[PDB]
Design an enzyme around this catalytic site. Structure first.
Site, PDB file in Angstrom:
ATOM      1  N   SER A 140       0.789  -1.228   0.000  1.00 18.83           N
ATOM      2  CA  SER A 140       0.000   0.000   0.000  1.00 18.83           C
ATOM      3  C   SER A 140       0.824   1.281   0.000  1.00 18.83           C
ATOM      4  O   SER A 140       0.243   2.352  -0.190  1.00 18.83           O
ATOM      5  CB  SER A 140      -0.942   0.024   1.201  1.00 18.83           C
ATOM      6  OG  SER A 140      -2.016  -0.898   0.992  1.00 18.83           O
ATOM      7  N   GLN A 176     -11.095  -4.527   0.126  1.00 16.27           N
ATOM      8  CA  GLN A 176     -10.593  -5.202  -1.061  1.00 16.27           C
ATOM      9  C   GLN A 176     -11.668  -5.267  -2.137  1.00 16.27           C
ATOM     10  O   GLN A 176     -12.853  -5.422  -1.836  1.00 16.27           O
ATOM     11  CB  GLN A 176     -10.122  -6.624  -0.735  1.00 16.27           C
ATOM     12  CG  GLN A 176      -8.831  -6.672   0.067  1.00 16.27           C
ATOM     13  CD  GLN A 176      -7.687  -5.961  -0.655  1.00 16.27           C
ATOM     14  N   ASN A 225      -8.848  -0.269  -0.682  1.00 18.11           N
ATOM     15  CA  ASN A 225      -8.244  -0.382  -2.001  1.00 18.11           C
ATOM     16  C   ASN A 225      -9.262  -0.130  -3.103  1.00 18.11           C
ATOM     17  O   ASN A 225      -8.920   0.418  -4.155  1.00 18.11           O
ATOM     18  CB  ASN A 225      -7.616  -1.765  -2.189  1.00 18.11           C
ATOM     19  CG  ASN A 225      -6.430  -2.003  -1.287  1.00 18.11           C
ATOM     20  OD1 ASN A 225      -5.751  -1.071  -0.869  1.00 18.11           O
ATOM     21  ND2 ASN A 225      -6.180  -3.266  -0.972  1.00 18.11           N
TER      22      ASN A 225
END
Ligand SMILES: [Cl-]
Ligand SMILES: [Zn+2]
Ligand SMILES: [Zn+2]
Length: 358
Positions: free
Chosen positions: A61, A117, A149
């Site tokens: 990340s 996710q 994300n």
């Protein structure tokens, strides 16, 4: 390196490696604007390949800091505005819940609960549209921050559409090449695989798996030397001769939201310096870092504050990374490891080093 740097690095990082069972590690300490490099252990245990200053690590990340700066560069080019609706760049996103969700919300995890996710079943463009079309928010936009994300990943994919370039081509031409990050990759070419460290999870060698929007959210690989240059670029944006990139770096360190003592930038997160070390250490634990928290808007965003602790944690299955820097002090650190070990241990070690050198 100056003796004081060598000493604190040995006393901090060698025991961290002992405590956390890290197979290989690279550290850069940026002191008075200059990088000093340290390596330990193995990039590939079975082959006994040592970590070197050319070893590639998965940033996880920390990749989001590149996405944030690329977005800032697009703002400075006039190609996007953070107030633009998401549907301006994806008109097929007709579902009503997307009315009112802007690029700002996507970039700063404030769209209203987009998930951490993208589901692993998403393997095509049609699947990705269905995912976002069927997602139901838990909160109104601009009220709660939930690290995701699927949020900043979509921001990155849409921010490059006006350029006509793919995300990877935009990143390569607009960020990597101007900054001479010549060993930084979204996709590691075959000629460079010899430098690509293995990550280790439960003793098994692993690399990150392909996934939707991976390049935007967690897919960059880099060396300790390129990451030190990335920190230098973010420490001293006026040294960057490309005006849109200089401005994009600055915009990624603007403060758009506040929760507690933490501020959200584009990719980067920031706190006022001097920082309370317990806050950054305790706040890095995923029990907090991944939790939903109410946010207060900063309108207009605060221009980049030089007296800041600017940082980002990153992980993949087999890697753990951390970057932190303090512009006012021309002081920073990069820590790249091929094991995903707990965030608070990373931040504590980084604090110990930078606190000793301030
Ligand atoms: Cl010692
Ligand atoms: Zn010792
Ligand atoms: Zn090379």
């Amino acid at each position: 390196a100056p003796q004081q740097i060598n000493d604190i690095v040995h006393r901090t990082i060698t025991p961290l490696i002992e405590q956390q069972k890290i197979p290989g590690m690279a550290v850069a300490v940026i002191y008075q604007g200059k990088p000093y490099y340290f390596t330990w252990g193995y990039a590939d245990i079975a082959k006994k390949q040592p970590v070197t200053q050319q070893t590639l690590f998965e940033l996880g990340s920390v990749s989001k800091t590149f996405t944030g700066v690329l977005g800032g560069d697009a703002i400075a080019r006039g190609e996007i505005k953070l107030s633009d609706p998401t549907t301006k760049y994806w008109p097929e996103l007709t579902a009503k819940q997307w009315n009112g969700i802007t690029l700002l919300h996507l970039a700063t995890y404030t769209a209203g609960g987009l998930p951490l996710q993208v589901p692993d079943e998403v393997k095509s463009s049609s699947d990705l549209l269905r995912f976002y079309q069927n997602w139901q928010p838990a909160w109104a936009p601009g009220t709660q921050r939930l690290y995701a994300n699927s949020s900043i990943g979509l921001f990155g994919a849409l921010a490059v559409k006006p350029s006509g370039l793919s995300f990877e081509q935009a990143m390569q031409t607009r960020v990597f090449q101007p900054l001479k990050l010549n060993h930084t990759w979204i996709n590691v070419p075959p000629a460079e695989e010899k430098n690509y460290a293995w990550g280790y999870r439960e003793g098994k060698a692993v690399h990150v798996s392909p996934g939707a929007l991976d390049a935007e959210a967690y897919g960059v690989k880099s060396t300790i030397e390129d990451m030190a240059r990335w920190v230098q670029s973010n420490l001293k944006p006026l040294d960057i001769n490309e005006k849109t990139l200089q401005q994009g770096i600055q915009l990624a360190q603007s403060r758009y939201w506040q929760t507690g003592d933490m501020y959200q930038g584009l990719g980067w997160e920031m706190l006022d310096w001097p920082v309370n070390p317990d806050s950054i250490i305790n706040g890095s634990d995923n029990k907090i870092a991944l939790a939903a928290r109410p946010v207060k808007a900063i309108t207009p965003p605060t221009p980049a504050v030089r007296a800041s602790w600017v940082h980002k944690t990153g992980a993949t299955g087999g890697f753990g990374s951390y970057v932190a820097f303090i512009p006012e002090k021309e002081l920073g650190i990069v820590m790249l490891a091929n094991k995903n070990y707990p965030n608070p241990a990373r931040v504590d070690a980084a604090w110990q080093i930078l606190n000793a050198l301030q």
